Ligand SMILES: C[C@H](NC(=O)[C@H](Cc1ccc(-c2ccccc2)cc1)CP(=O)(O)[C@H](C)N)C(=O)O
Ligand SMILES: *[C@@H]1O[C@H](CO)[C@@H](O)[C@H](O)[C@H]1NC(C)=O
Ligand SMILES: *[C@@H]1O[C@H](CO)[C@@H](O)[C@H](O)[C@H]1NC(C)=O
Ligand SMILES: *[C@@H]1O[C@H](CO)[C@@H](O)[C@H](O)[C@H]1NC(C)=O
């Protein structure tokens with residue numbers, strides 16, 4: 001009863017080549033599953049993380065290249081526009097020829113970069129105010145500095161949009177970096193050197209005098225500034241409670257409760273906010289309702305900003321934009337980022353231009369690219385099979401509610417309510433293939449010149465931000481997908497109560513209609529349960545069946561959730577990560593992902609058990625002395641065969657809310673009685689601790 005099909009031969013070969021059978025499954029299942037891969041592969045110079053999963057992403061880019069790189073006569077305008085955008089991006093000769101000129105022409109439009117001008121105070125300081133400058137960068141270019149104001153969905157009323165105020169992102173990957181010692185020293189040094197190098201190129205290009213000492217002096221004050229901001233931001237661990245984060249005020253309240261004085265204004269929230277929203281002919285009453293995500297940070301800001309010049313503030317503000325633009329200019333400008341990206345990512349070269357460009361067009365025209373992708377690469381009836389798997393796993397979640405001892409009856413009911421109400425999205429929106437008019441009209445207001453990449457990217461920034469802003473007074477569109485099709489990932493949205501499985505992730509090793517069921521459940525099955533369980537993790541349990549932030553938990557059941565989940569905070573917090581210098585994972589920041597992983601694994605396996613019940617056992621795979629329960633776990637694990645550059649491990653231990661792949665594997669299986677049954681693991685073997693965490 002060995003399966004001998006070509007599809008079985010492909011699966012088996014892949015499983016064999018990745019694994020190391022010389023390792024005991026019960027000693028370290030990651031090494032058992034993945035030790036073959038580890039030994040054979042070295043992380044590319046252009047990769048910060050590399051592994052089976054990242055390889056799928058690499059392989060998707062190859063498809064994008066194929067479908068973008070050749071004009072076809074029947075191409076509708078939406079597709080012509082994406083191909084032209086592609087072409088403008090890969091023409092390095094045209095870009096190199098422009099030097100930094102396309103940046104220099106921009107600079108006057110954001111109130112300048114003082115470091116890199118003469119007499120900035122005379123030109124710009126006159127008319128400068130922080131209201132105007134912050135708003136310009138925000139509203140025109142989508143760049144949010146000092147104070148992060150955005151239109152988004154209303155957590156407590158999911159059909160509506162509202163203005164939000166939050167702390168800004170930083171130039172370094174997390175607030176931690178701004179310690180600037182030890183493992184962060186090189187990044188902080190590279191960051192300031194990067195500032196300086198760019199200011200120098202700009203001055204050289206402007207034929208201005210260059211005084212290195214004054215360069216160093218101005219850019220160090222930028223760092224000192226952003227240090228204070230960083231230190232003023234709230235930690236992720238203090239931002240993990242959506243009920244606590246949601247503070248709805250009026251602009252009046254805001255003016256009265258969070259005053260700032262910049263360059264001696266002081267600061268008018270009404271004016272700042274209108275100077276943004278005026279940009280889509282929208283008018284803001286000092287009686288406008290606003291969601292304020294970071295009250296404490298605004299409070300802390302007041303003392304900081306009062307100490308700095310307009311010139312100081314704009315040196316940071318404009319750097320934070322210029323930062324992003326340099327890799328879209330000529331080689332000298334591209335070059336200047338080298339040490340910085342090495343410090344953050346460990347990479348010694350940039351990815352191939354065509355790959356960066358394929359990704360850029362994908363990111364900005366996700367529907368046009370998704371259409372070409374699914375036409376090239378996506379079966380068509382994958383969709384129907386996946387729809388049915390999702391039905392199954394949803395049922396298994398529902399059914400499991402009854403075995404869970406730590407909730408009461410009523411809370412279970414509402415949990416089931418929320419399960420039945422999750423709306424699933426599989427592969428791609430049929431629209432993007434079937435409705436040419438709609439797709440064209442999405443990009444109507446865009447027109448790309450093939451010789452002007454920089455103008456094209458700027459146009460995109462302006463477009464996407466004008467687009468987001470105008471949404472204020474409009475309802476949330478219930479049709480809209482939260483991902484393009486051409487993406488190797490999946491998603492849950494709490495505002496929308498929606499799970500999304502783009503075509504991009506519906507392929508081996510996760511899924512094929514042609515691969516064994518054990519593989520499908522331990523792969524895409526696990527991913528489905530993961531996304532579902534997000535509706536019920538420490539964030540998405542606070543949102544109800546309709547995506548509104550409202551407490552549907554009893555006191556006891558909510559306290560019990562915390563208790564059950566605390567086990568995982570401790571388990572994963574106790575993992576130390578060699579590649580990140582021996583640091584422990586953050587068990588709080590990874591909690592939600594770890595809950596989804598552990599829940600999803602249990603759900604998928606149950607669903608497979610049920611499959612076997614109903615359908616009988618599957619023919620075995622050749623070359624593998626494993627049964628299908630064992631294969632389920634093998635395939636599960638091999639999703640995460642991979643490794644990290646040390647520099648990136650230091651980054652993602654802070655910035656990634658997922659555990660690193662090896663610990664996703666060890667974590668979840670440590671917690672699975674089923675795993676330990678399958679591989680006959682001794683009690684208190686490493687893979688089989690007596691104490692096991694469970695939430696869903
Ligand atoms: C790769 C990672 N994405 C994920 O982990 C899941 C999708 C997912 C979930 C579980 C697995 C998994 C597979 C095998 C074994 C363990 C976990 C793989 C992908 C998507 P998600 O976390 O909902 C993200 C927020 N969109 C990321 O965005 O960086
Ligand atoms: C790159 O753009 C320049 C603009 O002058 C053009 O001359 C050249 O033909 C383009 N290269 C290609 C191969 O598209
Ligand atoms: C905002 O206030 C500034 C202060 O000079 C003023 O010049 C400008 O007209 C105001 N803008 C709006 C949108 O009210
Ligand atoms: C490690 O686990 C122990 C046992 O629960 C716990 O007391 C400790 O706080 C954990 N350490 C971390 C950093 O999670």
Ligand SMILES: [Zn+2]
Nearest residue numbers: 530534593596
């Ligand atoms: Zn997740």
